[PDB]
């Protein structure tokens, strides 16, 4: 039951930056590697694993996997895969910033906490084998309430002059 | 060293920063760069702060040369503000072109295989280093649409934007 139907294709050409021919072509590749048409979290991990002889990339992959799976049913189906591919590879600046925020905000309450931050940073190095993170966070955090909204994260990422401190 | 109106006028044309934003970044840049010039040695030490356990001197030097557009061995404010504008606010094509210029070490408008290895190597050094090369080779070959063994900006952008010929590179 892994085939691609026209109505799904047509939904996807509307919602993504891919043409029909392109979605079908990415579908072929996806199926080959994922014959059940579902890609598991460990499956995802194996993928990053190719990249880092160093480290355990597993934490980072889990976090990234968590944003990819829209319905949080433990799998990425093709629709979800192609949605995320389209954003991350062809999306505009603001879309990309939104998706980065969703990743940082693990618990989805619309705030990035110091710990929520520290975890992604921790994940990055772990994948690879601190006054600074605090420095960036604190400049972005314009009301100094230990909390980053989407607006603060967007403005700080787009080099609002508040961030000069954070550079050195 | 004061910021002239002509400089602000060209910078508001060339960048995404408003006049007001340009003057505040200029105050910030000056405080830590009293000379009005950023130096490669200076530029590397900054990188050393983020990467304690690596030697990021090679990566920083590559990045440095993209920033220093006139090639005179220093990053002035105009150079800094333009690279900051591109990397913080650029559309997808503009950021991918900045990426491409980083790879294209000799500035000849092409990325060779060697150029790509040099970049990958420098990241590894920075971070504490079958093979990476095999995996780089796959990406580069898929990117290389016409198989002439070099990459144009058009090939590199197409591949980065997930043209389906990049399937084999992920497989
Ligand atoms: Ca799912
Ligand atoms: Ca949260
Ligand atoms: Ca805040
Ligand atoms: Ca210069
Ligand atoms: Ca070149
Ligand atoms: Ca070529
Ligand atoms: Na402008």
């Amino acid at each position: 039951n892994s085939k691609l139907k026209q109505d799904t294709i047509d939904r996807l050409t509307t919602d993504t930056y891919f043409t029909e021919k392109e979605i079908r072509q990415w579908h072929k590749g996806f199926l080959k590697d994922c014959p059940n048409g579902l890609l598991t979290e460990q499956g995802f991990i194996k993928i990053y694993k190719q990249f880092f002889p160093d480290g355990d990339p597993s934490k980072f992959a889990s976090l990234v996997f968590r944003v990819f799976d829209e319905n949080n049913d433990g799998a990425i189906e093709f629709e979800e895969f192609i949605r995320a591919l389209s954003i991350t590879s062809r999306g505009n600046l603001d879309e990309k910033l939104h998706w980065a925020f969703r990743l940082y905000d693990v618990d989805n309450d619309g705030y990035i906490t110091r710990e929520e931050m520290y975890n992604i940073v921790d994940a990055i190095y772990q994948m690879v084998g601190q006054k600074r993170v605090d420095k960036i966070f604190d400049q972005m955090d314009k009301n100094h309430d230990d909390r980053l909204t989407l607006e603060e994260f967007r403005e700080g990422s787009k080099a609002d002059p508040r961030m000069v401190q954070a550079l050195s």
Side-chain angles (χ1 to χ4, degrees), chain A residues 1-153 155-168:
Chain A
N1 65 31
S2 290
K3 172 118 71 154
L4 197 65
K5 352 261 76 225
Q6 201 68 46
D7 38 18
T8 301
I9 290 170
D10 291 355
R11 210 150 49 243
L12 291 171
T13 68
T14 307
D15 295 345
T16 75
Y17 294 100
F18 290 118
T19 68
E20 181 175 2
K21 182 203 169 90
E22 277 171 350
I23 291 167
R24 290 175 187 278
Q25 252 146 233
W26 277 106
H27 183 251
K28 256 162 73 100
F30 183 79
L31 225 51
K32 214 182 92 197
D33 288 16
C34 296
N36 53 352
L38 281 144
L39 155 75
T40 80
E41 171 157 8
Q42 212 81 43
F44 210 83
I45 290 165
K46 314 285 236 320
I47 271 139
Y48 277 64
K49 264 172 177 330
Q50 291 179 333
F51 281 33
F52 296 96
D54 264 347
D56 190 352
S58 296
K59 187 194 244 255
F60 186 83
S62 319
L63 289 148
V64 175
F65 182 93
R66 59 135 304 210
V67 63
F68 273 61
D69 188 49
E70 270 298 322
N71 59 9
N72 309 290
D73 69 19
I76 298 165
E77 84 208 15
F78 177 65
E79 197 153 11
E80 294 173 335
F81 166 80
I82 203 66
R83 271 172 206 272
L85 181 70
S86 170
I87 289 161
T88 46
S89 90
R90 291 191 184 182
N92 69 37
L93 172 82
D94 205 53
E95 285 160 353
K96 290 208 189 166
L97 291 171
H98 271 74
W99 199 92
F101 185 80
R102 275 166 231 190
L103 171 105
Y104 276 100
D105 182 26
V106 179
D107 69 22
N108 196 6
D109 63 5
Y111 290 103
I112 308 189
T113 71
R114 208 148 217 120
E115 326 97 65
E116 294 196 282
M117 183 66 73
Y118 296 65
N119 291 345
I120 294 100
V121 193
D122 175 43
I124 283 136
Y125 288 130
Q126 262 220 256
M127 187 182 60
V128 193
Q130 289 161 321
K131 65 179 170 180
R132 331 86 192 210
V133 171
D134 290 271
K135 191 70 136 221
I136 292 130
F137 181 104
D138 280 338
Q139 295 308 143
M140 293 202 179
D141 183 36
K142 67 194 157 157
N143 74 311
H144 306 287
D145 70 340
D146 238 58
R147 269 203 219 145
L148 293 190
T149 56
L150 183 50
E151 188 177 298
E152 273 146 14
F153 172 77
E155 295 173 357
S157 294
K158 299 212 312 196
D160 186 283
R162 311 190 258 274
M163 314 283 321
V164 334
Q165 290 91 297
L167 295 179
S168 162

Short mmCIF file of all heavy atoms in Angstrom, two decimals, chain A residues 4-26:
data_model
loop_
_atom_site.label_atom_id
_atom_site.label_comp_id
_atom_site.label_asym_id
_atom_site.label_seq_id
_atom_site.Cartn_x
_atom_site.Cartn_y
_atom_site.Cartn_z
N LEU A 4 2.05 5.99 -4.77
CA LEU A 4 1.73 7.41 -4.69
C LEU A 4 0.54 7.78 -5.57
O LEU A 4 0.61 7.62 -6.79
CB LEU A 4 2.96 8.23 -5.09
CG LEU A 4 3.01 9.70 -4.72
CD1 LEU A 4 3.05 9.82 -3.21
CD2 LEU A 4 4.24 10.33 -5.36
N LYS A 5 -0.52 8.31 -4.96
CA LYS A 5 -1.71 8.68 -5.69
C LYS A 5 -1.80 10.15 -6.07
O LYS A 5 -1.22 11.01 -5.39
CB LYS A 5 -2.97 8.31 -4.92
CG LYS A 5 -2.82 7.50 -3.68
CD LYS A 5 -3.10 6.05 -4.01
CE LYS A 5 -1.92 5.43 -4.76
NZ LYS A 5 -2.48 4.65 -5.90
N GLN A 6 -2.56 10.42 -7.11
CA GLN A 6 -2.70 11.76 -7.62
C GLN A 6 -3.17 12.83 -6.63
O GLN A 6 -2.68 13.94 -6.73
CB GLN A 6 -3.68 11.79 -8.80
CG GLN A 6 -3.46 13.01 -9.64
CD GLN A 6 -2.12 12.96 -10.35
OE1 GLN A 6 -1.75 11.91 -10.95
NE2 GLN A 6 -1.36 14.06 -10.28
N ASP A 7 -4.13 12.51 -5.74
CA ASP A 7 -4.62 13.47 -4.80
C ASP A 7 -3.56 13.89 -3.78
O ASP A 7 -3.48 15.06 -3.43
CB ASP A 7 -5.89 13.01 -4.07
CG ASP A 7 -5.88 11.53 -3.74
OD1 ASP A 7 -4.83 10.90 -3.73
OD2 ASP A 7 -6.94 11.01 -3.45
N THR A 8 -2.78 12.93 -3.30
CA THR A 8 -1.62 13.23 -2.45
C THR A 8 -0.57 14.06 -3.22
O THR A 8 -0.05 15.02 -2.68
CB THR A 8 -0.96 11.92 -2.03
OG1 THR A 8 -1.92 11.12 -1.32
CG2 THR A 8 0.26 12.17 -1.15
N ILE A 9 -0.32 13.71 -4.49
CA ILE A 9 0.64 14.45 -5.31
C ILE A 9 0.13 15.86 -5.45
O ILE A 9 0.89 16.82 -5.25
CB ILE A 9 0.83 13.83 -6.72
CG1 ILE A 9 1.56 12.52 -6.64
CG2 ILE A 9 1.61 14.75 -7.66
CD1 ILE A 9 1.57 11.76 -7.98
N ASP A 10 -1.15 16.00 -5.78
CA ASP A 10 -1.71 17.34 -5.96
C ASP A 10 -1.74 18.15 -4.67
O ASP A 10 -1.52 19.34 -4.69
CB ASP A 10 -3.09 17.30 -6.59
CG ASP A 10 -3.06 16.86 -8.04
OD1 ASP A 10 -1.97 16.67 -8.62
OD2 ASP A 10 -4.14 16.65 -8.60
N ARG A 11 -1.97 17.52 -3.54
CA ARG A 11 -1.88 18.28 -2.27
C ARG A 11 -0.46 18.83 -2.14
O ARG A 11 -0.24 19.98 -1.86
CB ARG A 11 -2.17 17.32 -1.11
CG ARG A 11 -2.81 17.97 0.10
CD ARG A 11 -3.72 16.99 0.89
NE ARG A 11 -3.11 15.67 1.19
CZ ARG A 11 -3.55 14.48 0.72
NH1 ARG A 11 -4.62 14.40 -0.07
NH2 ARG A 11 -2.93 13.32 1.05
N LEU A 12 0.52 17.96 -2.38
CA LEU A 12 1.93 18.30 -2.21
C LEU A 12 2.46 19.38 -3.15
O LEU A 12 3.20 20.25 -2.71
CB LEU A 12 2.75 17.05 -2.27
CG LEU A 12 2.58 16.11 -1.11
CD1 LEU A 12 3.29 14.78 -1.40
CD2 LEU A 12 3.13 16.79 0.16
N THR A 13 2.01 19.40 -4.41
CA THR A 13 2.46 20.44 -5.31
C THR A 13 1.93 21.80 -4.84
O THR A 13 2.60 22.80 -4.97
CB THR A 13 2.09 20.20 -6.80
OG1 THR A 13 0.68 20.31 -6.95
CG2 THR A 13 2.51 18.85 -7.28
N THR A 14 0.73 21.83 -4.30
CA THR A 14 0.20 23.06 -3.68
C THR A 14 1.03 23.51 -2.47
O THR A 14 1.34 24.68 -2.33
CB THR A 14 -1.20 22.80 -3.15
OG1 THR A 14 -1.99 22.25 -4.19
CG2 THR A 14 -1.89 24.06 -2.57
N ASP A 15 1.36 22.59 -1.59
CA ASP A 15 1.86 22.95 -0.26
C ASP A 15 3.38 23.07 -0.19
O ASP A 15 3.92 23.60 0.78
CB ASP A 15 1.43 21.91 0.79
CG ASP A 15 -0.12 21.87 1.00
OD1 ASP A 15 -0.86 22.79 0.58
OD2 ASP A 15 -0.60 20.89 1.60
N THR A 16 4.08 22.55 -1.20
CA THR A 16 5.50 22.52 -1.15
C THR A 16 6.05 23.25 -2.37
O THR A 16 5.29 23.70 -3.25
CB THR A 16 6.09 21.07 -1.09
OG1 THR A 16 5.99 20.42 -2.38
CG2 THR A 16 5.42 20.20 0.01
N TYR A 17 7.38 23.33 -2.42
CA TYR A 17 8.06 23.98 -3.54
C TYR A 17 8.50 22.96 -4.62
O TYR A 17 9.27 23.26 -5.47
CB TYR A 17 9.28 24.71 -2.99
CG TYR A 17 8.96 25.86 -2.08
CD1 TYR A 17 9.05 25.70 -0.68
CD2 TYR A 17 8.65 27.11 -2.60
CE1 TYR A 17 8.77 26.73 0.17
CE2 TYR A 17 8.38 28.17 -1.75
CZ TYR A 17 8.42 27.96 -0.38
OH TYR A 17 8.17 28.98 0.47
N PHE A 18 7.97 21.75 -4.57
CA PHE A 18 8.26 20.71 -5.55
C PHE A 18 7.20 20.56 -6.65
O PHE A 18 5.97 20.66 -6.39
CB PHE A 18 8.42 19.37 -4.82
CG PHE A 18 9.67 19.30 -3.99
CD1 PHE A 18 9.61 19.13 -2.61
CD2 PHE A 18 10.93 19.47 -4.59
CE1 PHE A 18 10.77 19.08 -1.81
CE2 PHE A 18 12.11 19.43 -3.80
CZ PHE A 18 12.01 19.23 -2.41
N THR A 19 7.67 20.32 -7.87
CA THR A 19 6.76 20.00 -8.99
C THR A 19 6.31 18.53 -8.84
O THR A 19 6.88 17.77 -8.03
CB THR A 19 7.48 20.15 -10.34
OG1 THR A 19 8.46 19.13 -10.41
CG2 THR A 19 8.15 21.56 -10.45
N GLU A 20 5.34 18.13 -9.66
CA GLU A 20 4.91 16.74 -9.61
C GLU A 20 6.03 15.78 -9.99
O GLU A 20 6.23 14.72 -9.35
CB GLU A 20 3.65 16.49 -10.44
CG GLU A 20 3.20 15.06 -10.37
CD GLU A 20 1.88 14.81 -11.08
OE1 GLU A 20 1.29 15.74 -11.68
OE2 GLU A 20 1.47 13.63 -11.03
N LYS A 21 6.75 16.11 -11.05
CA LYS A 21 7.74 15.16 -11.52
C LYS A 21 8.78 14.93 -10.41
O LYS A 21 9.21 13.80 -10.15
CB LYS A 21 8.35 15.71 -12.77
CG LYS A 21 9.39 14.81 -13.42
CD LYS A 21 10.30 15.66 -14.28
CE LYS A 21 11.54 14.88 -14.75
NZ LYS A 21 11.29 14.20 -16.06
N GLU A 22 9.15 16.02 -9.75
CA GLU A 22 10.09 16.02 -8.63
C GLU A 22 9.62 15.22 -7.42
O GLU A 22 10.41 14.50 -6.82
CB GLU A 22 10.42 17.47 -8.18
CG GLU A 22 11.49 18.15 -9.00
CD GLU A 22 11.62 19.65 -8.66
OE1 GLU A 22 10.75 20.21 -7.92
OE2 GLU A 22 12.57 20.29 -9.17
N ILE A 23 8.36 15.41 -6.99
CA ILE A 23 7.82 14.62 -5.88
C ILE A 23 7.84 13.10 -6.21
O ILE A 23 8.28 12.25 -5.35
CB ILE A 23 6.40 15.10 -5.48
CG1 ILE A 23 6.51 16.48 -4.84
CG2 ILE A 23 5.75 14.11 -4.52
CD1 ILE A 23 5.20 17.20 -4.68
N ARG A 24 7.41 12.75 -7.43
CA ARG A 24 7.46 11.32 -7.83
C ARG A 24 8.86 10.74 -7.80
O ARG A 24 9.04 9.58 -7.42
CB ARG A 24 6.94 11.11 -9.21
CG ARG A 24 5.44 11.32 -9.30
CD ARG A 24 5.10 11.20 -10.76
NE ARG A 24 3.74 11.52 -11.11
CZ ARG A 24 2.73 10.67 -10.98
NH1 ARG A 24 2.93 9.46 -10.45
NH2 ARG A 24 1.52 11.02 -11.35
N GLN A 25 9.84 11.54 -8.22
CA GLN A 25 11.23 11.14 -8.22
C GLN A 25 11.79 11.00 -6.83
O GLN A 25 12.46 10.05 -6.56
CB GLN A 25 12.05 12.10 -9.06
CG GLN A 25 12.48 11.47 -10.37
CD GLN A 25 12.53 12.45 -11.52
OE1 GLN A 25 11.93 12.20 -12.57
NE2 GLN A 25 13.26 13.55 -11.35
N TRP A 26 11.50 11.93 -5.94
CA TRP A 26 11.87 11.73 -4.54
C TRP A 26 11.10 10.58 -3.91
O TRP A 26 11.59 9.99 -2.93
CB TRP A 26 11.62 12.98 -3.68
CG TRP A 26 12.73 13.97 -3.75
CD1 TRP A 26 12.74 15.19 -4.43
CD2 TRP A 26 14.00 13.87 -3.12
NE1 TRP A 26 13.95 15.79 -4.28
CE2 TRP A 26 14.74 15.04 -3.46
CE3 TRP A 26 14.61 12.92 -2.32
CZ2 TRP A 26 16.01 15.25 -3.03
CZ3 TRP A 26 15.90 13.15 -1.87
CH2 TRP A 26 16.59 14.29 -2.23
#
